[model samples]
Target chain A: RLSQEIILNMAEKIIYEKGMEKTTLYDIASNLNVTHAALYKHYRNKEDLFQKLALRWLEETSREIFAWTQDAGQTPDDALHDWLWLLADTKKKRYKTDRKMFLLYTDYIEQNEELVKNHVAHLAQKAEEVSGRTNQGNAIITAFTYFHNPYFASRWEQAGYVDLFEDVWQIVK
Target chain B: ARLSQEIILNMAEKIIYEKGMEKTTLYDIASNLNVTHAALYKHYRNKEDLFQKLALRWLEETSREIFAWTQDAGQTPDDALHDWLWLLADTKKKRYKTDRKMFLLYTDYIEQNEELVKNHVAHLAQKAEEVSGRTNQGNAIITAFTYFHNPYFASRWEQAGYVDLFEDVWQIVK
Candidate 1:
């Protein structure tokens, strides 16, 4: 018999593998040897499941970054460097997964521009809350996004900005 | 007075420059001219045969133009270096989806057949030798040899916003 944890794990695996494009509730349910109706006991709906996935990714990123910043020091400059480097490292570690998810993210961003805009804007605001100036905070976000993006990040790494977080820190402070 | 093979080569160039190698399948060539692959088979054995022919044709054609362009413009060889650099820089500026296909296909081949591609590299080196000769100042030969391969390197540079570095190089004598 499949546990709820097992079913949810498999379902999430399916989502990551096949993506939101091809994966369906029926597919997940079948993979777990259950009916579609039975899968609902674990997840409310597909949209609900997706919302959870998005929230989990965003929350995990925010929680990790925020926790790292607070722990690094009280000074805004140190906090900012840690914040940027931590985010850059996090993104770099996840780049392999991101490479696989490239097309999915492109599709998601296209389909949910408003969601991305709100998510990005709110993240920037959170950065500002720490650093004081929205511009500087936003610069961190812009730099993070640019250096974290697969295309330019690879180029930046090639161009010897491997410790780019420190480089930005040199500039910002 | 003599017959030349430029006509079929011109057709290949049109297809290569337009659709690029990835999209310029043998079927595409046949379809574009209202012929069959069987008909193309008479001219060439397969697509690889067509590509080698096209590559050589482009090399010759580009070399001729480079000679004319270099001689017509530069008073010294090093001035010719700036012209060579800027020509590539401007070409890099014009990004096309087709160019991506062109470059990726070229890169794929280069990676797969390094030894085979060295012959193509040699062909380009020869062209650079001619350009270097006209400049009659410094070792145009060495610079020409370097410039041909720099386009691929500059593609990455342009993407990294180091394009200004090219312009900076053009102006810098030492």
Candidate 2:
């Protein structure tokens, strides 16, 4: 398809093969078998195209990861805990099953640091939104960082840390 | 430098590596090194002192990898802490998985040498604060996440759903 989505998707592959600096719209177009001018029809320039791709990744991941909205059966007390529990569970599983892709995301996350900061703030707000507890979700995240943070992935599957995470929560919650 | 001391300890380490700490003896190390037990005693006041030195060297060597880290560009607090602690957990786990003899030696060594272990623990907690930039939480965080790094818990490192347990506790805490 000659849509913006396909062009952005093709651009990511080209960017991966070549470093982002080396990746040109022409390179992306030639790879996609479209004229270079055709890419201009979709993007203002490479910067805009890359920007959209970054935002798309953020939203797509947010949906994939934080897709669970609290259900009525779930109580307020466990809201942040359950959400973070799911967040940690999701991150660990994703890292295990899609390690290369998870790593690829890690690579891009730094380049999009501001976006990541934005995304984290967005996620943190949900803890308040879920429990009606103002401004503590981020504190919870910071306190138990080993859970969702990729740096601690090595111990993510190690036993008994689950209870430790709960120990911190009881103190904070 | 008492070169024989180095050779004696080398022989002792070899025997200990293959035969374990409890099974190996000063006599075994001395005979393997083709030296008299008297010469060995000259190097080490006693067998306990020799084993203590062996365990201490292992701790120092292993800890260099565990506590030392190269900085990452554009790193943040969480990432720094993560890399530091990741090394801690992995070093402990890999050693437990691969070198249980020496690992168990340190385990036993710590029991008899509580002060040495505490010194190591205090330094490690300080190192954690240095990396995570949360000095206040060093002792608490180290104690909190003990299961991942503490050699005493090596028995549970291989359990199924170990990460799940890690995440479950992470949820409760984070």
Candidate 3:
């Protein structure tokens, strides 16, 4: 029997390839050689499953960014620079590595407003802690908006975004 | 007396704003204008044709407003950039507040209209060039401020207080 973790991993792949609207629980179950009823045992509904997957995907960045900001050896400015670069680089990598999945996340973001708001607030708070000014956090968010905003990531990547981020960092940091 | 083309176009805009792009049809526009659908065809061949004209009008209006910002000679480059960004964010926020469906409709229309999008971007780049004083720097400035001017980002930024965020972007631009 596939574990819950294994099912989630497969669901991510299926959703990425087929899209959320077209993907069904039965498809995931069939792909895993399990019954749709078996999948229901793990997730209450499709919304719950998608929420879990999106939350899981977001936590990947949240954990790293939080850790990077609190690293002792790095100066505040250095930490901020590193954090922004990582944010932009990760977005660029997402576009290159799994564009279909990235697009799925964008659509998922639209449907899950609370999830995105909390995530943005959390990041802004961390930025404030690193910069030691409340407004600085908001400044960082706006200055590096393209880096973090998924809507612009693909366009930014196409426009040579890494170099552009460096230019803004000069002003932001 | 028959209604003028401009009056018909304005009615079309209202119908599009009130109803969704998909729901607004020539028949509805004609009925509202007290004309026949066949008469509407004389002005616009099809729905796509009418949409293209509406899209062009929006782009031209946007370009005109944007150009007005770059023409203020009394302001410095830094001030010009800052003011321009604020204007864009404020304008977009108003659009979101007053006419969300129209705003969304424009976004969808923009995607399908390649010539108009290119023209819009080129005009924006020209404005950026006047402020930044170089081709590449202007492009970089536009890239950095995409969140403020672009409808997709601007709409999202509205939920997060664009006016307050504008201050942050000003720090970078100035």
Candidate 4:
């Protein structure tokens, strides 16, 4: 189908392969047998396309973890444990595929301190309802704490810090 | 008195403090003082010669602060540890923006001219020995010195990451 849906699908694949920084409008156009102008007709610009893709990726990851928590039972502590593992696993996968971009966005998140607070609060509120202050507040309090800790930041993929989440779980116990 | 060697040093120091060592040139200082670059060489052999003096002054300032804290008459081991870490962290954070470049210069200077910082440490250990009542307190002082020398810890402050380590340390100390 020579439709806009097909163009966006093709655009996602090109971005995934070439990265957001290296991928260009001309590259996306050529991949779909369309002109550069045709791609702009669908999206405003490259950043608009990237912003949509980044938001879509965030939604996809968030939903995947949310789904896992749903299946993993309703206990706040247990669900959070599973959620962090899923999130770490997702980061590990992304780190291997687009290491530079992954690090770049990590810096971006650091600068946007409110976004992190919102994320932890969202999870912590869920956890609070199920297991009370101890389990619920653990994730929220440590979210800001761990972000500042460089060892955890640098070694998240090397399995050196997997115990941090477990250690907090033990606190719950 | 109007244009003496001391005046040249003051001008160079002003430029170095304002622009850092790498950015400030002898010509910059010369221009700042309404003099020519050629006249600066008459006072100091070269930029390196002038910078060596500036570095010595900064080091001496650090040495004085450390020595003053060490000289407190009734100091304890725990006090020493806390003071050492606190001073280093405070200094690192205070100098955060310019520290990376300063550290690079410091490492080079220390590697090549160990005696500059070593003499201060030697004097400090002598003072520690007199005040410290515990056995092998000399070793304690040296261990504290060695601990602060860790580049990983320095880099953490430089990157402004790793609050966990500091939190862990404070918990232990408290």
Candidate 5:
């Protein structure tokens, strides 16, 4: 019997390999050796399936960055810097390994504006917890924008990215 | 009657703003201007060439506005940086509000023309150096405020507590 996790894992591979626009629920169902109706039992449509896959990607990538607060020895400043590095480097690595998946998730993220907002709010909430600063999480995100924003971070990849990131970190910290 | 370059450019801008860069063509511009496509060729070599010129004009105008804030004679480096950041954000916000398609077109043009962007950045760096009076001061300022200066981050900055965020950045960078 196919589970939701099993379906998601299959969908992720298919979307990543075949590209977002070309992949359909029928394709996913066939790949799983199931009927189209069986796939519909799990997902309302292709959009719903893709949204779940994209949300999974977001949850997995952000898990590490948010976990920085659990490191007892690190200060909020250290957590912030570490979080920025993890955020940017993970994105860079993903782009290098599987550009199609990266672009796919990015497109989904942009299309779902509420997802972006919720993510920001979560970051701000965690940042306030780590830093003890009142409502300063958004500011920290803004200050380190170049490193954390995937689009800007990609542009800086060709330049002196590491040095430039450190320079911003200096001012920010 | 032959259309002048300025008239052709204005019509091109209007079409790009109304429709989109991809949907627009020299033929469209010429038709809108009541001339033949050959007439546009007299003013511009090709569609890409015309788009590049329009993109350059947009960059130059934005650069002028940003520099105006920087060149406020009495402002300190910190004050200049703060005002310059806000002016850039506001300028971008206005562009986004009035015509998002046109804004995207400008971004596409910039990405296509690296040399033009480099020259524009060099001009900005020179002006920033003039204002700060410190070696690498301009670079430092840009590094500190990358989000505000970069167009990709403009909407993110706007939606994510832009005012409070700017104030926080000011305290840190200043």
Candidate 6:
């Protein structure tokens, strides 16, 4: 009766405290009193388990961003910055709060660039819903790259990057 | 196979347009022209030199639409820039991932030369100033439309939803 959610939660805890390299599926299985083979019932292997765990972890932030962008009450133009701030802010705070797992999440994103960009492509779709316009997503993904891109994660904490966003906005807008 | 510099250049561009830059080598060019690689070395001194010339020539040829921002009598500077950006992207899209050729050679261009690239960039600022009637903001315009023109995002262009992307940009600029 062990659930996928239950295994993921236990696996995440083990990796967080014990470290990803030190931890193993056997350890997670031992914690659950199930065979390491039981993990295979849910995840094909360690890499798949880690990949889904990272996706689950990142979506914990991405899902918030998706909702923030489509706040129809705000003017679509204004909503852009609100969503931008939230996007950078979430990553910065998460990185600050949990450096290990955030970086571990970063490693997964490194392996799956297109899958992650597809995750991001939905914001483009939602912006269309709110603004009644298409292609807003490409501008966000391409132009606002410095603000939201994972490679720029360290760049987020410094002051005055919003000015960078404004400069891009002036031309693209 | 007596290859003139012009003949070699044209064939290189042709081969790149069809087979792509990474796949097309001097050997490939020599074979196509029915010459030995030694014969190619006779005309073109180095692979870098050949591509450098190829890049500059293409840059020189593309000048018509990209910087043709001479502007119309009644057209706003905004409209001219908008049309210019569209043509900029359109030109790259047609030729880059196409039968005519654009970006793969651009990879060679930027990697091969720095000083020549500045002269190229200088004209960008010059034309931008001429059209916007302002100093120091040409780059601002270029950065604004980076995704459209940047080879980094050309893969997206290959998927081709740019008609809507171009208009969405214009709705703000226009």
Q: Using Cα atoms with residue i matched to residue i, what is each candidate's TM-score against the true structure?
A: 0.48, 0.50, 0.70, 0.43, 0.81, 0.57
Native-referenced Cα lDDT, model 6: 0.69
Q: Please give, as one word, the docking class of candidate 6.
A: acceptable
Q: Which pairs in model 3 have colliding backbones?
A: none
Model 1 lDDT per residue over B1-174, tens place = 321345445666678777677677767766766655566676778788878766555444434544455445535755565566455435433432335654555444553444545454454445444554533222222222232233333343434324443443233222
Instruction: Give the TM-score of chain A in candidate 1.
Output: 0.68
Task: Write the residue-wise lDDT of candidate 3 on A1-173 in tens digits.
Answer: 76989989999989877888898888888999886787878986887888889888778745767776447787778877877777667766777876776778767976687997787777788887876666667666766776778866546535445676776666555
For model 1, how does the per-residue alpha-carbon lDDT over A16-44 read when each residue is reduced to its tens digit?
A: 78788688888888887776677767777
Candidate 2: C-alpha lDDT: 0.71
- The window of 10 residues in a row where model 4 chain B has the poorest summed lDDT is B143-152
Q: DockQ, per-model, please?
A: 0.03, 0.04, 0.44, 0.03, 0.55, 0.31
Question: Each model's number of backbone clashes?
Answer: 1, 15, 0, 1, 0, 0
Q: For candidate 3, lDDT tens digit of each residue in B13-80?
A: 98988877689888999998887789888888888888888978876674566677643767776777
Please give the TM-score of chain B in predicted model 5: 0.82
Q: Tens digit of lDDT per residue, candidate 5, span A1-173?
A: 97999888888888787877899888888898977788778887888888778888888777876776448787777866777777678767777776676777987786678888788678777777777777677777667666656665346557667877777777667
By TM-score rank, best first, the candidates go 5, 3, 6, 2, 1, 4
Please, what are the lDDT tens digits per residue for candidate 6 over residues A52-92? 78878877867776766454477776666566667667767
Task: Select the stronger candidate by lDDT from 2 and 6.
Answer: 2
Report how closely model 6 matches the true complex, as a DockQ value: 0.31
DockQ of predicted model 5: 0.55
List residue ranges in candidate 4 displaced over 4 A: A1-4, A68-141, A144-154, A157-160, A168-173, B1-174
lDDT of 2 by residue, A1-173 (tens): 59877898898777766756788888888999987676777885887777677677657655755667777787887866787787778778778876765666655664565766676677777766776766555554545556766655656765556875675566556
Alpha-carbon deviation at B16 in model 1, angstroms: 8.1
- Residue runs of model 2 more than 4 Å from their true location after superposition: A15-22, A44-47, B1-174
Alpha-carbon lDDT of model 1? 0.53
Native contacts kept, each candidate: 0.00, 0.07, 0.51, 0.00, 0.66, 0.44
lDDT of 2 by residue, B103-148 (tens): 8877667645657866886888798788878745666566556667
Q: Which has the greatest DockQ? A: 5
Index of the highest-TM-score prediction: 5
User: Tens digits of per-residue lDDT for model 5 on B78-127?
Assistant: 66756766776677777766767767779667955668766766666666
